[PDB]
Write a protein that binds this ligand. Structure first.
Ligand SMILES: N[C@H](Cc1nsnc1O)C(=O)O
Ligand SMILES: N[C@H](Cc1nsnc1O)C(=O)O
Lengths: 262, 262
């Protein structure tokens, strides 16, 4: 049929998608700003379509509920036809690639450790060999899944501790993880993707630090329902943007150009 | 029909595919060793197929000849049905994705600068602002194409110089680029992918160094003829291997576990 407005599912995660300071006075797509808001614009331009940005209802990235077997988050929105595409920091994983399509990565990343400055921790091994400093991850997504599945000694040890720790060491959003690290006087370390970690490191009150090397290497991809016609065009659009140096500039724009820590 | 031996096209590039020291006494796939030889084995195991490794005839990665319009190298082998899959450090690019399929990346990289230790160069800008130290790239592939296409000031300036430099600053293979840097007393710098650069840095006589940050960010993908049935299984295989930490171990195995520079 004729062209139709493409429904984009995304998530409120700084600095990918954030509410403009004056969003209360705006409406539609203009309420949002950020790396993925800019990328969405570029993709639509190159693919030739108009779109409506919609924040995922449950605020989740996407996981298959072990109970109901129903996919939640942005992945779910695609799987059940609620949205036509996902433009956000959605990590490309095996379980997800089995149910939806992913474009080649538009950004790279790896699980990392975030500590309050001064915390005596330099690695995952360090965390696994102590109990005074608690640690956790987002309550769902590629990181939690990484630990739940891991057969690597150190990571499995970490998972055994995290899953049974009481009170919970898991958080609902990255913002909550960051807040916990900042208010825990170094007694809480947060495991999240290097990209968000690096961003937060340049935000006031500049009291957090990324320590150690990444535990893995992967990337974010633009997702579409399995078999979607839009998939191929989006993929080529992503590659073109990267080769034009456009993605690199968007990265600098939202991460370092306006860092608040010097 | 029934299963058939899968023809794998690859390229002799250390440490991805190298001739074993005693290859002269061996035959078939057993003549070769390296990261991609190991990856090929893992992919075949996970995808359930047997294969024959064959070194690309022209020794090229793959480019569309401006004259004949014919694709050469490994890309050509796929495009014309000479091979069923390419397992090598083949860079995922737009022009290539338009003619063949690529799995999600199995390794990340970026164009980098290789200098003989001591050379007064720390960046691409540095190179572009001087003439005493000549510089070049492989005579074909994603790096040369990066410069030929680039609209970025500094890189276009570099391309203008390189393309017209006499004698040629381009080389036929990475090995030739490395040799030129090592024998040029610092008067030649080589532009190649960070992965090969980092590998060479840990090889005797340990006289080369990677300097500056990468000029871009991209990845290597396993390639198959456009629409090939093998594509989907290979892609999932790649993701599974990465999530098992297998790719990380292969990287260490062939890059650092046996570095000869400490
Ligand atoms: N990219 C998210 C996971 C994530 N983002 S920041 N910290 C995390 O664990 C996913 O795709 O699940
Ligand atoms: N990966 C090659 C290019 C390359 N490899 S080492 N130095 C280079 O320029 C290609 O896919 O063309």
């Amino acid at each position: 049929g004729a062209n139709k407005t493409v429904v984009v599912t995304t998530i409120l995660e700084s600095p990918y998608v954030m509410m403009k300071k004056n969003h209360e006075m705006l409406e539609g797509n203009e309420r949002y700003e950020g790396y993925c808001v800019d990328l969405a614009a570029e993709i639509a331009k190159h693919c030739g379509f108009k779109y409506k940005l919609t924040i995922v209802g449950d605020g989740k990235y996407g996981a298959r509920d072990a109970d109901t077997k129903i996919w939640n988050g942005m992945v779910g929105e695609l799987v059940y036809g609620k949205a036509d595409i996902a433009i956000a920091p959605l990590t490309i994983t095996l379980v997800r690639e089995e149910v939806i399509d992913f474009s080649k990565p538009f950004m790279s990343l790896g699980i990392s450790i975030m500590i309050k400055k001064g915390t005596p921790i330099e690695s995952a091994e360090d965390l696994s060999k102590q109990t005074e400093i608690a640690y956790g991850t987002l309550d769902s997504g590629s990181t939690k899944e990484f630990f739940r599945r891991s057969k690597i000694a150190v990571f499995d040890k970490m998972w055994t501790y995290m899953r049974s720790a009481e009170p919970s060491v898991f958080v609902r959003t990255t913002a909550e993880g960051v807040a916990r690290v900042r208010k825990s006087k170094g007694k809480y370390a947060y495991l999240l993707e290097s990209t968000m970690n690096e961003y937060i490191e340049q935000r006031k009150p500049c009291d957090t630090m990324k320590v150690g090397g990444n535990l893995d290497s992967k990337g974010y991809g633009i997702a579409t329902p399995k078999g979607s016609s839009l998939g191929n065009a989006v993929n080529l659009a992503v590659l073109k943007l990267n080769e034009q140096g456009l993605l690199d500039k968007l990265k600098n724009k939202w991460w370092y150009d306006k860092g608040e820590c010097g």
